[PDB]
């Protein structure tokens, strides 16, 4: 069916079809403690053009290019869930493992804040069954787990040709991430902001699907 | 799914070359979503290195004159009786009021820093707040 | 017309300056029947045990006073390319409110 594919490629011409500009503000990101970072000794190598400056051995993440890379990441995850996509919150962290799993259940998504075994998304032919639809999008809110080591899900995602939209801070490896964005992910009031912005993206992707279902159903 | 060589480079070019070849007769949807809105940097694989020799980190710091003013204030007096409230974005503590008085007195036109300092001290003492300093 | 430098120039973390002997107020968000995790602000939070006096007074949502030491407090080792992070502040408690 050509009409089924033409209606999906129509919002791709728009630079901002979902209008993801009013979801945040230049002043709201400051009150949520986003520009904060770790010390100067724990700073990773691939983290120099993403830092504005230091404040007594405390790097300050610049919000200029942060908001630029954030809207390009939210728009990428919007078109994925719009075309019947599958997301997965992989963030092994023992502090907010309850809020992440509930936001995916209320919106009908998928989460994974538990221990990662071995042959999950890689060896899916002898574990979950014969043919299993692997998630085409993995959201990494916390890349580093509880051992300070890059997780294996971001390494296996690029193996099976699967993108990954992660939230890199200042001690991660933002190389295999196709849409990185420098931002803090250790503050209590900060992680509640990114978890809510991802929830509002679902309310404008899968809930907005009904606006285009009535256009094709007029013929039959 | 396709090529399992993540150490070569980004996935976009590999998927493009795999589809252009002829073994994978299916256009991925995430590929279309990616080429519809390209980011700013291809996710290439770069092996991290270790700095040696004269190679340093070209990351400048952030300093102002208010830092020196607050340092001198803490060296002369110390901590104030008011507690810092980090929950309020526009919380004016004792140090903020002190540096504001200092800069609004400097905007006039004087060259001696000790005179400005003692004038700001007398002004804040005669205003209302009494900084219980040490002996 | 608001840029980026003016946002953190007047920020409280830049107004306090050094984090050495500073009176800061905090709140309580989680109690493990032994510790009082005080969230004064910033990136990390402070930790402290139950004092012998006013044990039942300190509950979830109690405004207390802290001395405010190092926010992250990290230190490198002998044969370590990087230093570890404890995600703790550890500030000395003063009084109530």
């Amino acid at each position: 069916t050509d009409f089924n594919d033409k209606i999906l490629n129509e919002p791709l011409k728009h630079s901002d079809f979902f209008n993801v500009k009013e979801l945040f503000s230049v002043r709201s990101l400051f009150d949520a403690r986003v520009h904060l970072g770790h010390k100067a000794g724990c700073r990773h190598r691939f983290m120099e053009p993403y830092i504005f400056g230091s404040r007594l051995d405390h790097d300050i993440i610049d919000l200029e290019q942060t908001a630029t890379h954030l809207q390009l990441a939210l728009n990428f995850t919007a078109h994925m869930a719009y075309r019947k996509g599958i997301i997965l919150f992989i963030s092994r962290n023992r502090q907010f493992s309850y809020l992440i799993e509930n936001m995916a259940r209320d919106c009908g998504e998928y989460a994974h804040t538990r221990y990662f075994r071995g042959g999950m998304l890689t060896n899916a032919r002898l574990l979950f069954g014969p043919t299993v639809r692997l998630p085409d999008l993995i959201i990494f809110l916390h890349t580093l787990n509880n051992i300070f080591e890059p997780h294996v899900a971001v390494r296996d995602a690029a193996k099976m040709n699967i993108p990954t939209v992660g939230i890199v801070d200042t001690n991660c490896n933002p190389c295999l991430i196709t849409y990185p964005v420098p931002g803090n992910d250790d503050s209590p009031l900060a992680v509640h902001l990114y978890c809510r912005l991802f929830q509002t993206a679902i309310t404008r992707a899968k809930e907005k699907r009904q606006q285009v279902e009535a256009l094709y159903r007029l013929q039959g | 799914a396709g090529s399992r060589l993540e150490t070569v480079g980004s996935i976009f070019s590999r998927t493009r070359d795999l589809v252009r070849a002829g073994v994978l007769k299916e256009k991925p949807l995430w590929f279309d979503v990616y080429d519809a809105f390209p980011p700013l940097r291809e996710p290439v694989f770069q092996r991290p290195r270790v700095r040696y020799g004269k190679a340093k980190a070209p990351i400048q710091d952030i300093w102002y004159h208010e830092d020196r003013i607050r340092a001198k204030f803490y060296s002369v007096y110390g901590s104030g009786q008011r507690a810092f409230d980090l929950f309020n974005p526009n919380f004016k503590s004792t140090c903020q009021r002190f540096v504001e008085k200092y800069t609004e007195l400097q905007k006039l036109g004087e060259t001696d820093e000790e005179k400005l300092f003692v004038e700001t001290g007398k002004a804040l003492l005669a205003e209302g707040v009494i900084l219980r300093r040490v002996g | 017309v608001e840029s980026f430098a003016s946002m953190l120039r007047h920020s409280p973390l830049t107004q306090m300056g050094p984090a050495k002997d500073k009176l800061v107020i905090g709140r309580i968000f989680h109690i493990v029947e032994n510790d009082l995790y005080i969230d004064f602000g910033g990136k990390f939070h402070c930790v402290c045990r139950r004092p012998e006096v006013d044990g039942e007074k300190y509950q979830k949502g109690t405004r207390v006073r802290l001395r405010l030491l190092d926010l992250e407090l990290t230190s490198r080792f002998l044969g370590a390319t990087t230093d570890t992070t404890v995600l703790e502040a550890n500030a000395v408690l003063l009084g109530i409110q």
Partner: peptide
């Protein structure tokens, strides 16, 4: 506009502790 960070002498530095007999002979 004029709020750019300036790399100066880096304040918040207390005088380093000396020896107990450095000032004497």
């Amino acid at each position: 506009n004029e709020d750019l960070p300036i790399s100066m002498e880096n304040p918040y530095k207390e005088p380093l502790k000396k020896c107990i007999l450095c000032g004497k002979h």
